Amino acid sequence: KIPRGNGPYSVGCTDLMFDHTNKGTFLRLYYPSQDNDRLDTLWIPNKEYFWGLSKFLGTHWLMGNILRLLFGSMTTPANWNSPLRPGEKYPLVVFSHGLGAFRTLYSAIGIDLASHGFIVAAVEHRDRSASATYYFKDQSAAEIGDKSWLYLRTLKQEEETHIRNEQVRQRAKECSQALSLILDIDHGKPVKNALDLKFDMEQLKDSIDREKIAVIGHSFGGATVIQTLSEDQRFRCGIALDAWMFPLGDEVYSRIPQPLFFINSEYFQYPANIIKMKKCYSPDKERKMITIRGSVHQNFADFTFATGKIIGHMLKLKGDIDSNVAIDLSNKASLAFLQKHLGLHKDFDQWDCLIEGDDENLIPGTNINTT
Numbered sequence: 001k002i003p004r005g006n007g008p009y010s011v012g013c014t015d016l017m018f019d020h021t022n023k024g025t026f027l028r029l030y031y032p033s034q035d036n037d038r039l040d041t042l043w044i045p046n047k048e049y050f051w052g053l054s055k056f057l058g059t060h061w062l063m064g065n066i067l068r069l070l071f072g073s074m075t076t077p078a079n080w081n082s083p084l085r086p087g088e089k090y091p092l093v094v095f096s097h098g099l100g101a102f103r104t105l106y107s108a109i110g111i112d113l114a115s116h117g118f119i120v121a122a123v124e125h126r127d128r129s130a131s132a133t134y135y136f137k138d139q140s141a142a143e144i145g146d147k148s149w150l151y152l153r154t155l156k157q158e159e160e161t162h163i164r165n166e167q168v169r170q171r172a173k174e175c176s177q178a179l180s181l182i183l184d185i186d187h188g189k190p191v192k193n194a195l196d197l198k199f200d201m202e203q204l205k206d207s208i209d210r211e212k213i214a215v216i217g218h219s220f221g222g223a224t225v226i227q228t229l230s231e232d233q234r235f236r237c238g239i240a241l242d243a244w245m246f247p248l249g250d251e252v253y254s255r256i257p258q259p260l261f262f263i264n265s266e267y268f269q270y271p272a273n274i275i276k277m278k279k280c281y282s283p284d285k286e287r288k289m290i291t292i293r294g295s296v297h298q299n300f301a302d303f304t305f306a307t308g309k310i311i312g313h314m315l316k317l318k319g320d321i322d323s324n325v326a327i328d329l330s331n332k333a334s335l336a337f338l339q340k341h342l343g344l345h346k347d348f349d350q351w352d353c354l355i356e357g358d359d360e361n362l363i364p365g366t367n368i369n370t371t
């Protein structure tokens with residue numbers, strides 16, 4: 001099981017696609033909800049995601065059918081299409097997924113943030129870094145729900161530097177475009193969701209605390225954090241979860257005025273990556289870095305909760321640390337940082353010690369020696 005949120009709010013969930021094209025925004029929304037008696041949210045909602053996952057794992061596309069057999073009815077504890085909790089303006093997190101992932105695979109993070117009173121827009125990227133994504137070729141196709149699927153792109157070695165950078169740049173644009181979409185919904189723009197879902201978007205009118213915006217992301221999504229902050233000053237801080245720094249252009253590093261928090265796994269990180277993170281540092285800038293002891297790269301994604309301990313450890317979905325313990329550290333440390341740099345009037349400063357890596361399962365800064 002994907003854990004329930006630790007915060008006081010019930011969590012709702014819905015999907016938003018606007019416009020219907022491959023250039024439109026596609027996101028999964030997690031939000032504080034009025035009600036707590038809806039059906040739980042389907043974790044991976046289409047067979048094509050499973051096909052995409054098996055291609056990303058380098059297996060038979062028919063191995064995707066076995067993943068579907070095992071995981072196709074799995075849910076995540078958010079109230080599907082629940083009404084938005086009224087009477088409050090909510091801070092906004094835009095969240096960017098990693099390579100081979102898609103919008104639904106970071107619900108442990110999205111639900112926990114929502115249960116503490118955030119709206120979370122988890123974008124689905126159309127840069128061919130998702131395992132799979134979909135869109136509609138035109139208005140006709142959208143009406144009848146005739147989906148066009150777009151699958152992960154594999155690269156030749158000679159394509160690596162250039163294409164990863166084009167993708168992180170599109171990823172940042174998709175984050176800004178998702179922000180503009182939510183901000184226009186907040187400020188009352190009528191939006192026809194390309195998906196026929198029983199959640200009226202008119203609920204989001206006057207529901208965003210418009211100054212309190214952050215960008216969060218894992219791996220390729222952590223590079224997306226940094227690119228996004230450098231090009232869109234509407235985002236006031238960013239949290240990079242085990243960022244994979246390779247996609248970033250050399251120009252970006254001296255161009256991040258916003259506060260930036262690195263939360264790293266112990267076993268993923270390496271000198272070339274840490275060096276790149278340290279290039280984001282300068283004395284006028286707010287930077288923080290922590291490492292979770294005993295953790296692996298996948299500790300930030302929902303796959304860490306999808307299997308048992310032995311199979312978990314074998315597939316590198318779990319580390320030596322307990323998955324609930326690790327995500328609690330990452331989510332609590334993130335809440336304290338967001339309180340500090342967004343100016344929230346909550347009680348998230350109870351976790352200020354974690355921003356400093358002060359906990360028996362935290363390393364201050366990094367374990368990686370770059371000297």
Ligand SMILES: Cc1ccc(N)cc1-c1ccccc1Cl
Binds near residue numbers: 067306307315317
């Ligand atoms: C089995 C597996 C191995 C590696 C990664 N990264 C993900 C998976 C996976 C895919 C779909 C559903 C559940 C899981 Cl655990």
Ligand SMILES: [Ca+2]
Binds near residue numbers: 176231232233
């Ligand atoms: Ca911009």
Ligand SMILES: [Cl-]
Binds near residue numbers: 267268298
């Ligand atoms: Cl790892």
